Amino acid sequence: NRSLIVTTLLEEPFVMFRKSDRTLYGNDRFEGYCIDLLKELAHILGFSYEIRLVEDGKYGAQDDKGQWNGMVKELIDHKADLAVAPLTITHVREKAIDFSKPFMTLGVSILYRKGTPIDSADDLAKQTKIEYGAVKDGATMTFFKKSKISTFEKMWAFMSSKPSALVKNNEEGIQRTLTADYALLMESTTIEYITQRNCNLTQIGGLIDSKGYGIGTPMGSPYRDKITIAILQLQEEDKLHIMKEKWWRGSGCP
Ligand SMILES: O=C(O)C1=NO[C@H]2CN[C@H](C(=O)O)[C@@H]12
Ligand SMILES: [Zn+2]
Ligand SMILES: [Zn+2]
Ligand SMILES: [Zn+2]
């Protein structure tokens, strides 16, 4: 019976600082796909909220002893009621927090330079001249680290051997792809956002897996199912479609 604490994280085009000449404060600072989603959900469910950025700026990963960080940890410690962000639904996280039904589907894939013979992840694993990596303590890093597939196990060996291969966030990864001979293992949504704005980059191959983003809540929260119902309502009303198209408009690359 009070406002909800919504934890999220700066990530284009999901959550961003609004551009304005006036000094903005509070929730009015933020814009993006997940901000629109949060507004729709708050309207359907009828609750007010306060948006807070994660301290460590990470999504969530487990260390050796099993301790979590990032938004996942924020939910575990009950520091936030909802995690409204591109939080990837993974079976590993499902045992620590609860996810709503997905509001967007995606998969792991490769971001790399255009015009290059490379066309798959195995091409990255079978050579060592072209460096590759992923975001630190993310769903992708956990995917390669806990993968039992031979190729992905070798790739995880390569990423883990180079401390510079794992980047802090998508930003550093994209810059690294632009400056060095480096391919970035990331999620297909971000790739789609980038390749429509940067015509020299492209996606290599298809989706290495298939999963979705969901709203995170502490385990056993009564708002998980309510948010699922709201997401289903928005899908029937076709609003997630027009939101996605709203924030994924591309300048266009010929
Ligand atoms: O791990 C990745 O490839 C990711 N890219 O951006 C973030 C979106 N969700 C993933 C997560 O929940 O960790 C992060
Ligand atoms: Zn209405
Ligand atoms: Zn709680
Ligand atoms: Zn459309």
Side-chain angles (χ1 to χ4, degrees):
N1 195 16
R2 186 170 174 86
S3 299
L4 304 185
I5 304 301
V6 175
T7 184
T8 189
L9 188 47
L10 292 173
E11 184 78 45
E12 304 183 6
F14 297 93
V15 179
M16 308 168 287
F17 283 140
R18 196 205 218 285
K19 290 290 185 294
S20 181
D21 294 328
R22 303 148 65 176
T23 303
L24 306 180
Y25 299 94
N27 306 337
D28 191 274
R29 297 170 295 168
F30 305 98
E31 67 176 0
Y33 175 93
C34 288
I35 301 299
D36 290 356
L37 181 56
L38 177 51
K39 290 182 182 180
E40 294 292 357
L41 297 171
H43 177 64
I44 294 173
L45 295 188
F47 65 83
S48 59
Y49 54 87
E50 185 186 24
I51 300 171
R52 302 182 180 179
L53 297 171
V54 191
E55 295 176 339
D56 58 31
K58 294 193 287 187
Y59 286 85
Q62 275 175 310
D63 60 19
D64 190 341
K65 297 184 72 182
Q67 292 296 68
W68 286 92
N69 59 12
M71 294 190 310
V72 179
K73 188 61 172 171
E74 295 293 330
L75 299 174
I76 293 166
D77 298 350
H78 297 257
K79 306 298 188 183
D81 301 278
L82 306 177
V84 181
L87 182 61
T88 301
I89 304 169
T90 69
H91 301 292
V92 176
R93 289 172 174 174
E94 285 173 337
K95 83 180 294 182
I97 59 172
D98 283 340
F99 286 100
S100 72
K101 281 191 175 174
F103 61 83
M104 182 179 294
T105 53
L106 63 139
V108 177
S109 191
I110 301 166
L111 178 69
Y112 193 54
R113 277 132 48 202
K114 258 165 171 190
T116 307
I118 195 176
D119 195 35
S120 65
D122 286 88
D123 297 333
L124 284 176
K126 73 184 188 184
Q127 59 83 55
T128 58
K129 185 177 186 178
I130 303 170
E131 186 175 348
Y132 54 90
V135 178
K136 172 181 173 58
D137 295 331
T140 302
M141 191 212 71
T142 301
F143 168 83
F144 283 94
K145 178 178 179 184
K146 299 182 177 181
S147 179
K148 303 172 186 175
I149 302 305
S150 181
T151 302
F152 308 151
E153 227 162 0
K154 300 293 183 62
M155 293 178 65
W156 171 241
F158 184 88
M159 298 176 192
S160 185
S161 62
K162 289 302 178 183
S164 59
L166 299 176
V167 297
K168 184 172 179 180
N169 54 17
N170 284 332
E171 183 177 10
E172 178 176 344
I174 298 165
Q175 287 293 308
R176 191 176 180 74
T177 303
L178 290 170
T179 60
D181 179 22
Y182 174 92
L184 177 60
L185 279 293
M186 76 193 313
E187 288 170 345
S188 57
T189 52
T190 311
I191 296 173
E192 185 181 4
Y193 174 75
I194 297 296
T195 59
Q196 284 176 346
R197 291 163 152 268
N198 184 312
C199 304
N200 292 325
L201 294 173
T202 187
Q203 181 174 314
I204 299 298
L207 276 56
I208 300 170
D209 69 347
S210 182
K211 52 196 166 191
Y213 297 144
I215 304 297
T217 72
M219 201 157 187
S221 172
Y223 288 97
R224 189 267 292 276
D225 289 336
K226 296 177 183 302
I227 289 170
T228 288
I229 297 168
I231 289 170
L232 297 169
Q233 178 179 343
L234 298 172
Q235 288 180 338
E236 264 202 330
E237 296 172 357
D238 198 51
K239 292 197 175 187
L240 303 180
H241 177 197
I242 72 97
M243 283 171 48
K244 179 265 163 56
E245 292 186 0
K246 177 185 175 184
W247 293 102
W248 267 258
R249 292 304 183 188
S251 65
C253 296

